[PDB]
Amino acid sequence: MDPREVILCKDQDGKIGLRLKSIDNGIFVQLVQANSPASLVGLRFGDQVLQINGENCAGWSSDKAHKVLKQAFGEKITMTIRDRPFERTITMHKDSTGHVGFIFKNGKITSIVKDSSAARNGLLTEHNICEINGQNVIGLKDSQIADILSTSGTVVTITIMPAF
Amino acid sequence: DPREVILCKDQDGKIGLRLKSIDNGIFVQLVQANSPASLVGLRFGDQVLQINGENCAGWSSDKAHKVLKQAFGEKITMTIRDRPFERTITMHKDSTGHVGFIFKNGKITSIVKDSSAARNGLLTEHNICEINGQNVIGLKDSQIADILSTSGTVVTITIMPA
Amino acid sequence: NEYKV
Amino acid sequence: NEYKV
């Protein structure tokens, strides 16, 4: 529940493989580039950035947050992170036809099927799917997500976050 | 896990409960004191999964209220997921007694620079639900400020997005 | 293109 | 009125 510190090194262009977004006067991770320093320290879509090099991110724009990272002195950058504060987990069971009972598009839940496991569990729409049975699905094509769900056993555990 | 409650209709047939549809779920929006709803511990932000053996998924506010009105007999059963959107943030007052945010109508609107709220990543567009475990939903802003002033130097606030 | 699951 | 706290 408490914030963790990460330490990362910037590449030649002052980059760490991170895009950030301003939400509700906080700063949140929006895109993590594959095999970047940011990926290595476990930063993920939805993680909140409290500080960059000890400076509070509160009220910063995303443009400002990126400028701070790019202009930071030295190679090493420290950030203080609160792990995905908006994340929740829902476990569903496939019915006799192998369905859990939702429709999604672009990795976002758009409808809940009547009287399904998703309905019983109170799955919400306008929520991004983050993980399915321990498989990160951020950045995957809908077909691969549908395939993960298809090959899943009966128990389907998803982590979701409001689309915010 | 969710929990089950059983409410008994009052004299008018009411239960002291107002609901709201959010993202095709149903959430508690207002709980009147000394009501059948308060007797079973319902709170602002609780998710209602089922009423009387019917899933609430996709129901409108309007539908949910009709259902509650026309429910037969005197016992209403619900399954509740406790405040799924709640988060708790702990702050520390500075030497002027301030934690570092601005609020209006129970909602945080600005975070003060160089404050405990800033340090701890307090967010705006969030409703203040509790202060040190004390419900403040439906209180006047002056009452909320009054409660903050007599909490300690360590102030834990429960919030949820608006 | 959406996916009912 | 807003409240600064």
Among candidates B82, B86, B83, B96, which has minimal Cα distance to B148?
Answer: B96
Tell me how far apart the alpha carbons of residues B19 and C3 are, in angstroms, rounded to a whole number.
30
| Chosen from A56, A108, A115 to mutate, greatest number of chain B CBs within 10 A | A56
Distance from CA of A110 to the nearest CA of C (A): 9
Nearest to B90 by CA among B125, B60, B138, B130: B130
Helix (H, G, I), strand (E, B) or coil at A2: coil
What are the φ/ψ torsions at residue A68 (nearest 5 degrees)? -60, -40
Cross-chain Cβ contact B148/D5 below 8 Å: yes
Integer CA distances (angstroms), A134 to A13, A98, A152, A158, in order: 33, 19, 11, 8
CA separation for the pair A88, A129 (Å, rounded): 10
Distance CA B103, CA B40 (A): 30
Determination technique for this entry: X-ray
CATH of region A1-85, choose from 1.10.1060.10, 3.40.50.300, 3.40.50.2000, 2.30.42.10: 2.30.42.10
Task: Please give the Cα distance from B67 to A164 (Å, whole number).
Answer: 31
What is the homologous superfamily of the domain A86-164 according to CATH?
PDZ domain (2.30.42.10)
SS3 assignment, position A63:
helix
A 119-138 → C contacts, CB under 8 A: none
Instruction: Say which amino acid occupies A158.
Output: I
Contact A127, B22 (CB under 8 A): no
Largest CA distance in chain A: 59
Q: Where are the alpha helices (DSSP H) in chain A?
A: 37-40, 62-71, 117-120, 142-151
Q: Which CATH class is domain B85-162?
A: mainly beta
Who contacts B96 (Cβ-Cβ below 8 Å, separation ≥6)? none
B49: closest chain A residue by CA: A122
Range(s) of chain A covered by CATH 2.30.42.10:
1-85, 86-164
Report CB contact under 8 Å: B24, A111.
yes
The β-bridge relationship of strands A88-93 and A108-112 is: unpaired
φ, ψ for residue B24, nearest 5 deg:
60, 20
Residue identified by tokens 């706290």 is D5
In chain B, CATH 2.30.42.10 sits at 1-84, 85-162
Cβ <8 Å between D3 and B109: no
Q: Is A12 exposed, middle or buried (0-12, 13-18, 19+ CB in 10 A)?
A: exposed
Report the SS3 class of residue A55: strand
Question: Taking Cα atoms as reference points, which of B89, B116, B86 lies closest to residue B101?
Answer: B116
Task: Say if residues B84 and B49 touch (Cβ distance below 8 Å).
Answer: no
3-state secondary structure of A56: strand
The pair of three-digit structure tokens given for residue B123, joined into one six-digit string: 């967010």
Question: What one-letter code names the amino acid at A54?
Answer: G
Q: Are the C-beta atoms of residues A69 and A14 closer than 8 Å to each other?
A: yes
Q: Confirm whether residue B140 is marked as ligand binding.
A: yes
Domain B1-84 coded CATH 2.30.42.10: yes
Give the separation between CA B22 and CA B18, rounded to whole angstroms.
Answer: 13
Enumerate helices (H) and strands (E) in chain C, giving the number of each: 0, 1
Instruction: Say if CB B155 and CB B140 are below 8 A apart.
Output: no
CB within 8 Å of chain D, chain B residues 65-124: 98-104, 109-110, 112
To one decimal, the resolution in angstroms is: 1.8
Chain C residues in contact with A101 by the CB 8 A cut-off are 5
Phi, psi of A42 (to 5 degrees): 90, 20
CB contact under 8 A, A146 and C3: yes
B93 is in an annotated binding site: no
**Residue B53 backbone dihedrals phi, psi, to 5 degrees:** 80, 10
Contacts of D1 in chain B (CB under 8 A): 104, 141
Cβ of B99 and D3 within 8 Å? no
User: CA of C1, closest CA in chain A: separation in Å?
Assistant: 7
3-state secondary structure chain B: CCEEEEEECCCCCCCCEEEEEECCEEEEEEECCCCHHHHCCCCCCCEEEEECCEECCCCCHHHHHHHHHHCCCCEEEEEEECCCCCEEEEEECCCCCCCCEEEECCEEEEECCCCHHHHCCCCCCEEEEEECCEECCCCCHHHHHHHHHCCCCEEEEEEEEC
Distance CA B135, CA B129 (A): 6
Residue A108 is encoded by which pair of tokens? Answer: 């976002």
Cα angle B89-B97-B109, degrees, rounded to a multiple of 5: 50
Residue B136: partners with Cβ closer than 8 Å, 6 or more residues away: B106, B128, B129, B130, B143, B144, B147
Give A67 to chain B, closest Cα distance, Å: 19
Q: Reduced to 3 states, what is the DSSP secondary structure of residue A72?
A: coil
Tell me if chain D has a CB within 8 Å of the CB of B141: yes
